[PDB]
Design a protein around this ligand. Structure first.
Ligand SMILES: CC1=C(CCOP(=O)(O)OP(=O)(O)O)S/C(=C(/O)CO)N1Cc1cnc(C)nc1N
Ligand SMILES: CC1=C(CCOP(=O)(O)OP(=O)(O)O)S/C(=C(/O)CO)N1Cc1cnc(C)nc1N
Ligand SMILES: [Mg+2]
Ligand SMILES: [Mg+2]
Lengths: 663, 663
């Protein structure tokens, strides 16, 4: 017979007690948002704790991810597979309750947050995925896609620039099933936010085309419930609920203070908080009657069973559509994709074309597009330069059943939206910008790798080869930054064949992202045997060789393979024993077993010459201390590209000369 | 005899002709903004072409930097040292007219733009610098600081998240002398912007607290002038002028189209444009009467001479303050700073303390603060964690003559604002956040290095040593990314003494930024001779040694130096000739003479073991192919730091074992 406030206080108790036992963590936000979470989760959220993978569940995102005990409490109380022992192991090694929530670690966590702002970006992507999937698959009388995307966010997320990027786009795309709750508590780590944060946030979001509900009492369940009902009734705009809350609600001495944000309350303060809240139970003790009101297993089972019957009827009327929905929601590839993609790759090798690898990428999209209806691609206002459109592209701002997103000049927001799209299921996202401006999206790229998400990242104009735009645009050190990122795959293809191989590798990579490093300028196609063609996917392989132990091994990537081969030919004609290794993917090469790596870069050969129009320091990993590196050590310059390659030493004469110093 | 429209058409002609001659560049925005520029530069801008370094000049920033021929036209026409021959060498190797404007390359260019959004961020920083410098130095009857900051920006800047960060903060700080012109032309690279950009931008900026002037006819001099007059009369709010323009104005067939954005118009179209504009002059022909109306040399010298006389009277009344103003505007250090800082460093070595290097950083700020009144420091909402406040910090939102900025949760905007502060003159900015979230500001960090700007970047919580917050917060590969950035200095100090040396190195840099990599946890102080103490500033030095040529060299940084020393003690006791090298700065080490680097890392010693809680791949540069690396190869985990170091191999047993594998 517990009131709604008592049910919300169960969150407050678990959160402050788990933080206290860990001696680490953030009690303030869970305590401030517990009443909002109680209304959302018990009255509106459509979910099944017994199947967190239900395709048509509502999605919930905690963008203020430091309040991780909020989501752990909700998952535990509603009946997910997250036992009380895991809450007692909050922030402990290998527990299911890490200090910030991580997808895959924990039943029912939808995304990994912690980096402020990216949660709401992920939620925008999930709402775009639902809207697009519903438009693609729903049929008259068979609305098999119909779910909401709810997000919690705080002052930190609102101040971050990425909130502007993704909430602006969400207004453009009229994401009426996206409902965000703003924890308007007036506190951040430096103290009272008025010293640095004075936006009329409601007016700002109305400028984006959002429906905004002002001045909600975040500690009054009836007020919260009425607001959510209003937001769900507005079907043509995303909704922002401005919830006035007290951080650390319940703590007599730390509520409303920055002290409650990110440190344990302390045992004496917790005792006083129990007395103020009227919460009598000991740490990690929850009575059966409170579990009875929180549990979602019976309602969740019933809702998913109803949906399963709806999907079964859909599968009868629309069998091919239903098979595709199941395939795409599972992330499985079409059964014939491997064979058709290999046939395309073989055709390219047999039919040389000297084209830019950005064009080879577009040709792969055109080839794979008819086979991968799950593609949801886009570019950050650079479709005619990145070459991301194919004949079958259809912008979703024109047709909601389309497959292409004009992201605007929003690299960070684009990449984190795409993380939300990949997390949702049903799609294979690709994103695109000039390689330099990956630096604007850098942490979302890292988050894709950390979350093991499939996304193809199409990064063009990869070096001084772009020419006159100059050093603010010319990448030098960006590829190295990607190569040292754990679980990132990075490909710098040297011709149209390596480009198609890299695209196939990316779409088939189920457990992490793949960045394609693509040229502005035309790249010569290299000759390959059948064995060499198959070895491209091994990341590094012997392209040109000699009999016996080489005196020199050239290691080259991308547009510089043509230069390395030319130097190899000059040296071979003078009687030098040389080898050329093409290294389109250092990460794929590193994953090959020791025997294969020894066959490509034998330990006996120390005279190694790396050639790449990128930062030189990276290449010590493969050249060692007794070789040479023909690379960049400076920023670029504004000039025609052919003059730049000459000025910076990417000439046959310089490569030959640096190699001869090792003989 | 020339009308204002004919004067603006000189910009149009020079811009379209120089783009055509280069067969490269962006004619549309210069042609669209030429009328706005004519009014701003001829009727309002206070500047002297004969001294572009005049301390009290207005600052102009082209945030839509692809329109570079706009600023080159203006600088040439008003009389700067930018001859017609340089405009005929637009985008050519070593010209003063690179494809995007670069500070230092060209008289009168205030900042380097090209990366969208960062120009307006730099402008916010310049306006903060002017407001703060005025508060510090102006005296009754002596207002020696009084100038405006004017910025041009387009749709790309408005879409970028950084515009939200810096314009939100500009509203909070009430930057009444900041006036921005929005080129509202409806076009971006993908086409008509309504498919991806639908903000009520005026309402958005009113939410920031800006004064906004809607619906300006950007091709009508009277409308523009009236709007600028209104914006200058609003002294307590930054102003945004919504200028409706036609991109490529004048071109019958490409005006208002994405085609005019980023490609030469073509010879035929330029001829049609001359006819439509009524422009009768050949390419690169400007008649003397048009120069006479544009030239700013006479008026600008009069204005600067008037200011010189004002400063002289200030110096009579306030001689110590005038001397400081001159010193700080020139960027010179106090003459006794070197000696006083060395005294502080020596005191630290003689009085050992085991403290976190973030605390040692705070202690260096406390020691240097009284000596460097030019400090204008801040943190992105992490003052209590980064430890950026000292006893003399005064926030400028409380006291305009202060020295500290609460930046809010805005890492990218903070860093690009600080670039504007350093470009303005008068200050030495420092910025700060958790090291992980440098990834949010990555391209602004790069721009500081590219522009050769002095800024100290204080990055704390540098490894898995931060503990329970987990892998979204624990840096692994970020330090390696900074280390390979051209013209970046990166320091990872191992105790409070190395931390003080690194701070001294950073503030004494005259030509680039310095990133400090600082621990959460306490670091033991190392014993040093006088020679070792002096060699910290060489970036790498011998900390522990043997007699004769070493058999084994440990190379360690930051918090892992203690681990390396413990392994050294174990192997030394066994009778191994071991050495420990402390490498707080790889870039300072690399710049040393070859004999010094050989004395530290002798080329004959291949048994090298690098030890650092960061990505392993970086260290091949110093250990080669025949050593060992005790580093990270994965993301982190949420757990207490002591357990993480054990789990990931940062133990004496593992370091010793990897060393014995080389012997
Ligand atoms: C600055 C910061 C916080 C501000 C919190 O203020 P808030 O209004 O969102 O939250 P509460 O009201 O809950 O205090 S939470 C936090 C953490 O490191 C922990 O994730 N950090 C550092 C941080 C900085 N920058 C980014 C991109 N992410 C972060 N997590
Ligand atoms: C997308 C993009 C531009 C369009 C900008 O449209 P706009 O409205 O600002 O300008 P116009 O009206 O003048 O079309 S200009 C351009 C370039 O690379 C060139 O700098 N880029 C790519 C680009 C992407 N992201 C960033 C951060 N900077 C860029 N310069
Ligand atoms: Mg808050
Ligand atoms: Mg535009």
């Amino acid at each position: 017979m517990s009131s709604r406030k008592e049910l919300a206080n169960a969150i407050r108790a678990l959160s402050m007690d788990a933080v206290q036992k860990a001696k680490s963590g953030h009690p303030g936000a869970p305590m401030g948002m517990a009443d909002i979470a109680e209304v959302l989760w018990r009255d509106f959220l459509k979910h099944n704790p017994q199947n967190p993978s239900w395709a048509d569940r509502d999605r919930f995102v905690l963008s203020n991810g430091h309040g991780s005990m909020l989501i752990y409490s909700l998952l535990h109380l509603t009946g997910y597979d997250l036992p009380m022992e895991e809450l007692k192991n909050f922030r402990q090694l290998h527990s299911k309750t890490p200090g910030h929530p991580e997808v895959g670690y924990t039943a029912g966590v939808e995304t990994t947050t912690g980096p402020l702002g990216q949660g709401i970006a992920n939620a925008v992507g999930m709402a775009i995925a639902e809207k697009t999937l519903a438009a693609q698959f729903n049929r008259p009388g068979h609305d098999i896609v119909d779910h909401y995307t709810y997000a919690f966010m705080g002052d930190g997320c609102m101040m971050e620039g990425i909130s502007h990027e993704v909430c602006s786009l969400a207004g453009t795309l009229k994401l009426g099933k996206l409902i965000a709750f703003y924890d308007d508590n007036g506190i951040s780590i430096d103290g009272h936010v008025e010293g640095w944060f004075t936006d009329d946030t409601a007016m700002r979001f109305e400028a984006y085309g959002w429906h905004v509900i002002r001045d909600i009492d975040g500690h009054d369940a009836a007020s919260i419930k009425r607001a959510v009902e209003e937001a769900r009734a507005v079907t043509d705009k995303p909704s922002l609920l401005m919830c006035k809350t007290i951080i650390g609600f319940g703590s007599p001495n730390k509520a409303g203070t920055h002290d409650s944000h990110g440190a344990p309350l302390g045992d004496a303060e917790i005792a006083l908080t129990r007395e103020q809240l009227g919460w009598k139970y000991a740490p990690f003790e929850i009575p059966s009657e409170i579990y009875a009101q929180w549990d979602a297993k019976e309602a969740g089972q019933a809702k998913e069973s109803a949906w399963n019957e709806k999907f079964a009827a859909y599968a009868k009327a629309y069998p091919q559509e239903a098979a595709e929905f199941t395939r795409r929601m599972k992330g499985e590839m079409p059964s014939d994709f491997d064979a058709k993609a290999k046939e395309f790759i073989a055709k390219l090798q047999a039919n040389p074309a000297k084209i830019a690898s950005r064009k080879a990428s577009q040709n792969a999209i055109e080839a794979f597009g008819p086979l991968l209806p799950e593609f949801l691609g886009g570019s950050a206002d650079l479709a005619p330069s990145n070459l991301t459109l194919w004949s079958g592209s259809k912008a979703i701002n024109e047709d909601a059943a389309g497959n292409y997103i004009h992201y605007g000049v929003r690299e960070f927001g684009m990449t984190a939206i795409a993380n939300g799209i990949s997390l949702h299921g049903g799609f294979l996202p690709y994103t695109s910008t000039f390689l330099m401006f990956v630096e604007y999206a850098r942490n979302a790229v890292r988050m894709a790798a950390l979350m093991k998400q499939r996304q193809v990242m199409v990064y063009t104009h990869d070096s001084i080869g772009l020419g006159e735009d100059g050093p603010t645009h010319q990448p030098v050190e960006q590829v190295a930054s990607l190569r040292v990122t754990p679980n990132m795959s990075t490909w710098r293809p040297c011709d149209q064949v390596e480009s198609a191989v890299a695209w196939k590798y990316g779409v088939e990579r189920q457990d992490g992202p793949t960045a394609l490093i693509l040229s502005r300028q035309n790249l010569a196609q290299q000759e390959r045997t059948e064995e060499q063609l198959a070895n491209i996917a091994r990341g590094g392989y012997v392209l040109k060789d000699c009999a016996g132990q080489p005196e020199l091994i050239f290691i080259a990537t991308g547009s510089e393979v043509e230069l390395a081969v030319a130097a190899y030919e000059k040296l071979t004609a003078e009687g030098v024993k040389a080898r050329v290794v093409s290294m389109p993917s250092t990460d794929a090469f590193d994953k090959q077993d020791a025997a294969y790596r020894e066959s490509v870069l034998p330990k006996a050969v120390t005279a190694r010459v790396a050639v790449e129009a990128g930062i030189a320091d990276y290449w010590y990993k493969y050249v060692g201390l007794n070789g040479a590196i023909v690379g960049m050590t400076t920023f670029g310059e504004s000039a025609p590209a052919e003059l730049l390659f000459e000025e910076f030493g990417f000439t046959v004469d310089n490569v030959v000369a640096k190699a001869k110093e090792l003989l």
